[PDB]
Amino acid sequence: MKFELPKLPYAVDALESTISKETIEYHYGKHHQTYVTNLNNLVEGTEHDGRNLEEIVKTSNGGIFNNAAQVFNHTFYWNCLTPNKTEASSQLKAALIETFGSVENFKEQFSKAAIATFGSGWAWLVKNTEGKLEIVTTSNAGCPLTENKKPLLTFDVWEHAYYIDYRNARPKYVEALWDIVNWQFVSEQFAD
Amino acid sequence: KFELPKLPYAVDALESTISKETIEYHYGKHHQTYVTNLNNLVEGTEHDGRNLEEIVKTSNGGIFNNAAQVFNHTFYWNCLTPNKTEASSQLKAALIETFGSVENFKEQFSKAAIATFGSGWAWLVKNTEGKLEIVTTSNAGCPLTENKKPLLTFDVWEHAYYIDYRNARPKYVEALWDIVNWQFVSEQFA
Ligand SMILES: [Fe+3]
Ligand SMILES: [Fe+3]
Numbered sequence: 001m002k003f004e005l006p007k008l009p010y011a012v013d014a015l016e017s018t019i020s021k022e023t024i025e026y027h028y029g030k031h032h033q034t035y036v037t038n039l040n041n042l043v044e045g046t047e048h049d050g051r052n053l054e055e056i057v058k059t060s061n062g063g064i065f066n067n068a069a070q071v072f073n074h075t076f077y078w079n080c081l082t083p084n085k086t087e088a089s090s091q092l093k094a095a096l097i098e099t100f101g102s103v104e105n106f107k108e109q110f111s112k113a114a115i116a117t118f119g120s121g122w123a124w125l126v127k128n129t130e131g132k133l134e135i136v137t138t139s140n141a142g143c144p145l146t147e148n149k150k151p152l153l154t155f156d157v158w159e160h161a162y163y164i165d166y167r168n169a170r171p172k173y174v175e176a177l178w179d180i181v182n183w184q185f186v187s188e189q190f191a192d
Numbered sequence: 193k194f195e196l197p198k199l200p201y202a203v204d205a206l207e208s209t210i211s212k213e214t215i216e217y218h219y220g221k222h223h224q225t226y227v228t229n230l231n232n233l234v235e236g237t238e239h240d241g242r243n244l245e246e247i248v249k250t251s252n253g254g255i256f257n258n259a260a261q262v263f264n265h266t267f268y269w270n271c272l273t274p275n276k277t278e279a280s281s282q283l284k285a286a287l288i289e290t291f292g293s294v295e296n297f298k299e300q301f302s303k304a305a306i307a308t309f310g311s312g313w314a315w316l317v318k319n320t321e322g323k324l325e326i327v328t329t330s331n332a333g334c335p336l337t338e339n340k341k342p343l344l345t346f347d348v349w350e351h352a353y354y355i356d357y358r359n360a361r362p363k364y365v366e367a368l369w370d371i372v373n374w375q376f377v378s379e380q381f382a
Contacts (some may be wrong), residue, residue, distance in 0.1 A: 030359050119348055120310040120350070121333035140310035159311070159350035160359065166202055166352065168221050 003043075003053065005036045006075050014083040018176045023164045031160055032074040039067035057145050073122055077156050082182035089187035099133040100107035107178060113137055114155045114174045125153040127190060152189045153181070193241065194231050196224045197266055205274040207368045214355045215366045222351055223265045230258035248336050260332040264313060268347050273373035280378035283343075290324040298369060299347075304328050309350040317342050318381065343380045346374065 008028055013021040038058075042064045042186040043049045046055050056068040088096065093103060106125075114123035117137045124136040124150040133152075136144050144151050155177055162173035199219055204212040230247075232242050233255045237345045247259040279287070284294060291297035297316075304326050305314035312330045318341035319325045327335060335342045346352075346368055353364035 026358055034359070119312075159354060163350060163354040164358075167217055167355075168225075 001039050001050075003036055003071060005033050006078070008078060010081075010083055015081055015180055017068070017083070018180045020122070020165045023129050023161070026164065027156075027160060028074075028078065032071070035067050035070040035074065039071050042067060054145060066141040069143040069146075073141065073143055073154065073156070076151055077154050078137045080153050080155075080182050081177075081180045082185070084182075086181070086185075087103075088183045089190065092183075092190045095133055095190065105129065107141055110135055110153075110155075111171075111174050111178075114157055115171050115188040117157050120140055120158040123155040123157060123185070126151055150189065153186045194227050194234075194244065194262065196227050197265055199269055201272075201274050206371055209371045210272070210353075211356045214353070217355065218347075218351060219265070219269065223262070226258045226261040226265065230255065230262055233258060238306045245336060248334055257332040260334040260337075263336070264332065264334055264345065264362045265347070267342060268313075268345050271344050271373055272347075272368075272371045273376070274371070275373075277372075277374040277376075279374045280381070283374075283378045283381050286324050286381070301326055301344075302362075302365050305348050306362050308348050314346045314348060315342055316344040316377070341380070344377045 004030075008024070008183075012024045012028075015024065018079060027187050039148055046064070048060060048064060048100065051059075053068060053072055056064065057072050060068055062177060076109070096103050096106045100109060110123060113135050114137075117139075119139060121137060121139045121142065124138065124144050126134050126136050126144045134149070136145065136147075136149065155174060157170065157174075162170060166173040195226060196219075199215070200278075203215045203219075206215065234247070236321070237255070239251060239255060239259075242250075244263055247255065248263050251259055279294070287294050291300060301314060301316065305328075308314060308328045308330075310330060312328060312333065315327050315329065316326050316333050317327055317335045324343075325340070327338075327340070329335070346365060348361060348365075353361060356357045357364040357367075
């Protein structure tokens with residue numbers, strides 16, 4: 001039928017001081033909503049009308065893709081953040097240590113990848129089909145589902161994600177995000 | 193050796209279309225960072241003591257990104273003005289032949305600017321058949337790399353407008369016409 005904007009998993013000011021109420025107002029309430037509205041408008045009456053969002057992401061192009069992948073990516077992003085205390089599962093910890101040397105090394109690499117992404121895009125931690133962990137960046141609406149990789153964590157690095165709160169200082173934004181990373185959600189995605 | 197070039201007007205001259213705050217970050221930090229980064233990247237390379245336009249036409253990766261952004265932002269600042277300007281008759285003529293009318297050009301150009309997904313630029317350019325053309329570019333993309341002649345550009349990277357308009361890119365694009373330097377577009381087109 002129609003896609004809806006998922007309910008935010010916390011209050012609009014739950015992520016202060018890291019992300020401001022105003023950012024959430026715009027980012028969730030306007031940008032993420034616009035993607036949902038556009039997706040519905042574009043899908044209506046096509047073969048994609050009725051398909052699950054992940055299939056649409058995996059199999060569309062043009063405007064449908066851009067809007068589909070952004071709806072997915074933003075929902076994923078809100079689930080990657082939390083005002084609550086969390087920690088990596090023992091299994092996720094062990095995987096991070098074995099792949100990147102330590103949890104802190106992963107954070108360093110991931111932060112660097114996120115800071116270096118040019119233009120609008122996303123930084124991802126993914127699990128490939130062999131179960132291996134990789135850092136993946138995407139441009140614009142790009143989503144690792146289209147490469148058959150399972151997303152575990154994402155940082156939005158489109159300027160709208162940080163401009164209100166950090167202006168051009170993306171590194172400060174990336175650094176601060178670690179304080180609200182939802183390691184429970186990341187761990188749950190890693191499981192399997 | 194590359195320098196941030198002087199803005200063609202005071203930092204607050206484009207109010208109310210573009211705020212002094214936007215000029216200070218956009219010009220004073222973003223533009224400057226591209227200049228700085230480029231200087232760092234070109235050093236010890238073949239582009240060291242090569243001109244900006246030659247670097248844009250002949251570089252890839254990080255050098256291209258920083259060089260093309262330097263060029264693109266200087267071009268953009270020259271496309272704006274606090275002063276009253278209008279199109280030369282030859283430019284106006286060319287606009288009417290290609291787009292039907294000046295207003296139709298502005299509609300189409302606005303549509304193009306608004307429709308550009310992600311970060312990028314909308315351009316009016318002169319192509320090899322001597323004709324006018326609207327093209328858009330992603331990220332640092334520049335018409336020089338297609339040997340096309342840029343006449344006007346709007347920056348639609350979110351930093352260009354987010355401070356003054358938040359997500360309302362169409363309001364930004366609409367407001368830009370108030371400050372478009374038709375003398376500069378006409379000189380380029382000469
Ligand atoms: Fe976003
Ligand atoms: Fe810019």
